[PDB]
Design a protein around this nucleic acid. Structure first.
Lengths: 96, 74, 51
RNA sequence: GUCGCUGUAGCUCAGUUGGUAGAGCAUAGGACUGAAAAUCCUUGUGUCAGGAGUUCGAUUCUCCUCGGCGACACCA
RNA sequence: UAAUAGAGGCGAUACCAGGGGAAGUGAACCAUCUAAGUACCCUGAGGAAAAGAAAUCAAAGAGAUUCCCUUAGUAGUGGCGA
RNA sequence: ACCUGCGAGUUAUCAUGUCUAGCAAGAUUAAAGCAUAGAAGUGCUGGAGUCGAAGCGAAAGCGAGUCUUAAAAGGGCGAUUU
RNA sequence: CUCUAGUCUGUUUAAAAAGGCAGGGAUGAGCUGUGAAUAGGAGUGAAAGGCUAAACAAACUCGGAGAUAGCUGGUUCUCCCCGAAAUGGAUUUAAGUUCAGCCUUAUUUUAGUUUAAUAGAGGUAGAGCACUAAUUGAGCUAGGGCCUGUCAAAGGGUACCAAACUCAGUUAAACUCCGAAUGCUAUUAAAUGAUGAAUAGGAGUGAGACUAUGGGCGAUAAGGUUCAUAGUCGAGAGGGAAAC
RNA sequence: GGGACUGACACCUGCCCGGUGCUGGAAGGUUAAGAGGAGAUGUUAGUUUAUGCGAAGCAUUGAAUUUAAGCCCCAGUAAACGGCGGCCGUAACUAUAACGGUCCUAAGGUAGCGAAAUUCCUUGUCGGGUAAGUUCCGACCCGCACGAAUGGUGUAACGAUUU
RNA sequence: GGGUAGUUUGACUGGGGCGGUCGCCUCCUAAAGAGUAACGGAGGUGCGCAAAGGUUACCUUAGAGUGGUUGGAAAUCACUCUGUAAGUGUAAAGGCAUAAGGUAGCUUAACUGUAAGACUGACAAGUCGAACAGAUACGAAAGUAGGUCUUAGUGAUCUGGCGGUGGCAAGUGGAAGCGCCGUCACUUAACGAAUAAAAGGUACUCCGGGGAUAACAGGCUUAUCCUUCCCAAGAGUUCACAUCGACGGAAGGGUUUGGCACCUCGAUGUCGGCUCAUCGCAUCCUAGGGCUGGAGCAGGUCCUAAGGGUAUGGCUGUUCGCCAU
RNA sequence: CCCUGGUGGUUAAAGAAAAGAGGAAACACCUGUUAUCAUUCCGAACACAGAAGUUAAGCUCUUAUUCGCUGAUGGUACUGCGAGUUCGCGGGAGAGUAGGUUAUUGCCAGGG
């Protein structure tokens, strides 16, 4: 009969579902561990190499682990730290 | 003819929180009180409600001068 | 006989502060030098309504 | 919160689409009856709640407030 | 009146469509809400019934209806209480 | 009343913890289809989906950082140590 | 022929409302046969909350239905290890529930607990009148009235009514110039050996009772009521207090 | 013909319309839907260097004006539901108070009855009945807390009623 | 619009009802850390202040005595002694001379973003806080100021209003709306707030339970009640005690009215009368005594003694009581 | 170094009262209000300007401890624990009594 905790506390806002841009994270360490020079890291190759699942098609590239191999990228978003490191190693970046 | 009274406030838990000779670090509360039952000595400060707190790490000590008790950090 | 007034930044018009003031004691137009956080600078605030 | 309004003599009430400050009651004085009453007569009783503007001048005209209103809608 | 044709009632304490439609309860009361379009009643049929060939979905480019798997206990909704 | 029988934490799903078994930054299919025989099996096929792999914030957005604010200046939540 | 005042029997009755003595009406608002009509929130009622199939302050049967119960009762084989609580907070709560406290299992962690020594803060017991009040007897003496050279001028006799002051002597949970013993906190050294703590799974409990001290209320009555410390029972068999 | 209350008969049935009902009456105060669209808002062809403004169309809205009953309001009605007071002083002893003053209300209980199927104190007080009567009968009135169609006071006859 | 329908109508409580109370603050109870209950003992409170806040600087009351126009016990002025007893908006407590008290000048820190570390704590919450960036007030400066000497003056969530920001914007661009920041509206006072919206009767009652809880009895207790006893001022012509003994003091009895709620509510039948009794002695009669203010008769008081006996009627349901014999 | 003045440290009052002593320097009294400064009137205080005079007061020192303050040793109250019971072990006031007490000290400036 005491007012429960979830009724003493207030609410905070909407959930913004139905409008999320949800999409898969892939890290530089993963790319280093799985790929090699010269091919195009993109939807098709990450899907067949089992870094993502073909439900999502808007990949983002994050910067955990280190990458050493010159590669070409065809992705949808990229973090500033990751693209700096990747340009420094000498790859190429096309945003799709 | 019922009782005209029966009314008491919540106990406020005053008193000395760290005993003389104990080791405290900066910001500790030492005494909670109404009024300067204990006054401030070296390296302590007084809050707006006369709380005694430690401005630096050290060991609490109580001194007496002219019958008044002073709290210090040494 | 005490009402909740609001202190308004002169040069922006934002209702930065709210305070209490006793009507029927001054019925003047209280002015207070208050710090207006929009400008990072103190300025003049005037009494005004709440609702 | 909103709507319809008022505040003018001690009380009640006019107040004219702007150039009056009064009407009735009461107060005080004279007269009358044996007094109390009732005539009759005189006589005071105002920033016309405050301010700004309209007018050549504003109780009045508008607006902004002050205090008091009647009535209506919400009220976690 | 005449002429034909088809109906009437039962079964199936099952299923289906339409019409009417509760309350015991839960919300530790209770009135919104819940139970629930459930129980029951009534009218119609069938071997299935109903629905069905977009004045549809919905931001994907699909292409009638119906029944499973998932989306998902998510989006929303609620004295934002249950 | 005595004696003898009957007479009470079960089942289906979801949440979470433990044990066992397998695989492993991956784990796993659901509905369903074919083959076989009639033998409500078991063998393949089925990756649609679900849970992990990145978090913070109301959210945009940015991401091993992010939110609060001009301030990593200090904190809240993170973490590099799965 | 119809009804039942009074009384008795009956009362595990012959009878799920009768029987024996009797009593009231008995040409009428009478009694009775055979049909028919009015149905559940409705009927009927010369009015009793009466009657409607022996049950009526809302009939019976079936269905919702295995309705809901913070309430009562019941819940079946064995052994080993550990082992409570009846408190605090909140509550349309006081016989309920929930969190904390107390228990258990698993992992991790290592530092409770009792002394001794040193050093700390109280205001209790006790005591005291220095503060706030109460109060005893003398001394002193304002002030008030009594009496007297009286006007009511300035006066004088003071049995008293008595402030303040002095000496002596008392009272106090809401008085304190003072003030222990135990208890509490910090450190160290010994002593005891998993009794501490963190995370996670599962709880139960939240009606207590008496005894030895300190109290409040009561009537320094209660096996009374309400708190604090410890013990026992609770959950503890055995010996003693004759039983207990 | 329906409803309400009272209940043969005899004598009677007093006062109060404030409260709440019922009946009648609209002068106002207030008031819904419907009409009425002051004005405000979103969109944009265009204008504006552009914002801003922004015609028309399409939408979301809303005030002033109009408006019924009801309520407030104005009366009537008690054989409508109901109500029907206190204090103080006063005479050729003592006692009481015919009388007077005062406060308040819509009005303050008339006739009759009264320790009653009503009276707590109470087994009130006096008389009758009994050798002895908390019951009974006849009165007194200090009616805790009678009272006039929820009828008042009586009444011949009647009662498986009570005393 | 009770014609009809669905419901509400609190809890604590030495049973319940009636009454009182419900949040917060101060003191005592509280047993010298903290905490600690009762329908235990005393009070306050739902604010006030544009200064009665901030800062700088300077000052010190009340009381007693004393000298003074009215002026008196006491107004204002001066001195002595006393040394906070005064005064701090508001209850009380703890504090307050360096004053937190009094006065004056300037002024708005009655600030934005934060906050190491803590106190208290079931939780939700509440409280203190050095120091840092921005920008002020006072001050020469050091420094102080994030309201008030401190502790009460308060109210969760949901819903809605107002201002700002421009985050979300159901195809796109807007917009309605929402989110964010600032902030307003609850005697939700039963004050951790069951609904936006709520009073009674049941003796016509019913069901689930309780001796967790009352009425009749048993038990504990003895305030009250009853029976004595201690002290003896007195009354009694004198003479405390022949007799009565006031004012007080100490006990027992368990019968009266009560207190407590320990047994019993899946039942312990309640007042009188009838019938039948049995026991106690604190003795009404009969029996044996002591003393009398006992001439005799008849008594008064006290002691021993329970063998037997201890009336019929009127009124009332009565026990009781009155009345007649 | 000592005196004087200033400024601290260690706390038991380092408290006031009365009497006596001095004053070279130092301190203070004291003098004028005119300039800047101050009082809810007053040069009292504060402030500025100075050297006529004095221990009178303040100040330092010396006194009977006159008031205050402090105060043992024993004993008592009280108290933790205890199979000793008004007893066994340990802790131990307040009041009173005998007393005591008119501080001590660091480093800066002046000159002894």
């Amino acid at each position: 009969g005491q007012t429960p905790l979830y009724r003493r506390l207030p609410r905070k806002g909407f959930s913004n579902s139905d409008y999320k841009l949800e999409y898969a994270i892939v890290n530089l360490g993963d790319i280093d561990k799985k790929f090699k020079d010269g091919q195009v890291v993109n939807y098709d190759t990450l899907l067949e190499n089992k870094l993502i699942k073909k439900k999502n098609k808007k990949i983002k590239i994050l910067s955990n682990g280190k990458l050493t191999k010159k590669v070409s990228f065809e992705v949808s978003k990229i973090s500033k730290s990751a693209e700096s490191l990747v340009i420094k190693i000498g790859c190429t970046i096309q945003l799709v | 003819g019922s009782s005209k009274n029966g009314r008491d406030s919540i106990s406020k838990r005053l008193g000395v929180k760290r005993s003389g000779g104990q080791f405290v670090k900066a910001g500790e509360i030492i005494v909670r009180q109404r009024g300067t039952k204990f006054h401030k000595g070296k390296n302590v400060g007084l809050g707006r409600d006369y709380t005694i707190f430690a401005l630096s790490s050290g060991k609490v000590e109580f001194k007496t001068l002219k019958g008044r008790k002073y709290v210090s950090i040494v | 006989a005490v009402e909740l007034i609001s202190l308004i930044c002169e040069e922006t018009g934002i209702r930065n502060y709210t305070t209490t003031k006793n009507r029927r004691n001054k019925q003047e137009k209280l002015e207070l030098m208050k710090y207006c956080p929009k400008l990072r600078k103190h300025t003049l605030h005037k009494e005004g309504k709440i609702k």
